[PDB]
Amino acid sequence: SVQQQLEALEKSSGGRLGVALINTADNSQILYRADERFAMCSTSKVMAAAAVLKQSESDKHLLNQRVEIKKSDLVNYNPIAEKHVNGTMTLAELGAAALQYSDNTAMNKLIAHLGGPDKVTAFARSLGDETFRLDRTAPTLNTAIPGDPRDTTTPLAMAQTLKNLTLGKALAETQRAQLVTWLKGNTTGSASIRAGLPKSWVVGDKTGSGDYGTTNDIAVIWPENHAPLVLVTYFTQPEQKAERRRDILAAAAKIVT
């Protein structure tokens, strides 16, 4: 069965695997450690991007507002913000770079705009998400220490909230459509969930990775002749310097789909 398969995969991998698949045709689920907390790592960038889209519902000027990018702004991983030092980026460009390239300076500017990590958590609560918590900025939100509650959520909570954000009630249509366009344009997810799926299927995703070989990916999947599926695959290991295992997320996605 699927549960036995996921159990075997988890056992031979040497880590802890969390899976939540929601089939939106009937709202049936496939769950594996779906109520356990996992460090989100960069999959939390979706909630920061969505929090700014929610604001743009009430403020027409918002997404075009330009933000200066100083050399002092740069942290470790800034592939897009590094091309803009001494120049500017709009909040829409920051949203895009945070999601499609996992840029950490882009994430931090969006949190700075919102008023801090606690404002992202308050946006999550407003969505009915009682589990999500964002406590730090990038990149220390990637420490992924075993048993630390900071910057964590559960696979089921993130699968429900990602469904509501991309396919449901969370955002007004233009904002929901923009978030979906940014997720489908992701450039960092080829080796994760996408690699375990039929090539014809359209996928929007956000990967995350961190210490303790924490390897995450959250995805909305549009099969060619069926209703969408929402899949969250979180994976973490007992040792701090473990390698990431994107192939375990592709193996789990192959099993549940």
Q: Which residues pair with 175 in a beta bridge?
A: none
235: enclosing H helix or E strand: strand 229-236
- What are the structure tokens assigned to 170, written together? 């969370």
| Phi/psi at 169 (5° precision) | -80, -10
**CA end-to-end distance (rounded Å), the chain:** 13
Give the whole-angstrom CA distance, residue 191 versus residue 10. 18
DSSP 192: T
In this structure, the strands spanning 88-90 and 16-23 are unpaired
H-run or E-run covering 94: helix 91-100
Please, are residues 192 and 233 in contact by the beta-carbon 8 Å criterion? yes
Q: Are 89 and 117 in contact (CB under 8 A)?
A: no
Closest residue by Cα to residue 138 from 241, 210, 30: 210
Of 222, 251, 238, 212, give the one whose Cα is nearest residue 32.
Answer: 251
What are the distances in angstroms from CA 145 to CA 53, 148, 214, 248? Answer: 31, 6, 10, 20
Which is nearest to 171 in space by CA: 155, 186, 182, 185?
182
Closest C-alpha among 204, 205, 131, 126 to residue 169: 126
Q: What is the dihedral of CA 175, 176, 178, 180, to 10 degrees?
A: 170
The 8-class DSSP code of residue 246 comes to: H
Q: Render the burial of 148-159: b for 16+ CB within 10 Å, e for the rest.
A: eebbbbbbbbbb
Angle (nearest 5°) at CA 152 between 150 and 155: 165
Dihedral sign, CA of 187, 39, 138, 111? positive
Rounded to whole angstroms, what are the CA distances from 147 to 21, 41, 68, 106, 108?
Answer: 24, 14, 37, 28, 25
CATH number of residue 39's parent domain: 3.40.710.10
Determine the structural domain holding residue 246 and report its residue range. 1-257
CA-nearest of 36, 53, 3 to 234 is: 36
For the chain, the domain total comes to 1
Catalytic residues: 42
Which phi and psi angles does 28 have, rounded to 5°? -80, 155
> How far is residue 162's CA from residue 30's CA, in Å, rounded to a whole number?
16
User: Where is the binding site for substrate, in residues?
Assistant: 206-208
Helices (H), the chain: 2-13, 45-56, 91-100, 104-114, 117-126, 155-166, 173-184, 246-256
For residue 99, give the amino acid letter: L
Helix/strand/coil for 48: helix
Torsion angles phi and psi, residue 232, rounded to 5: -115, 125
Rounded distance between C-alpha atoms, residue 76 and residue 138, angstroms: 9
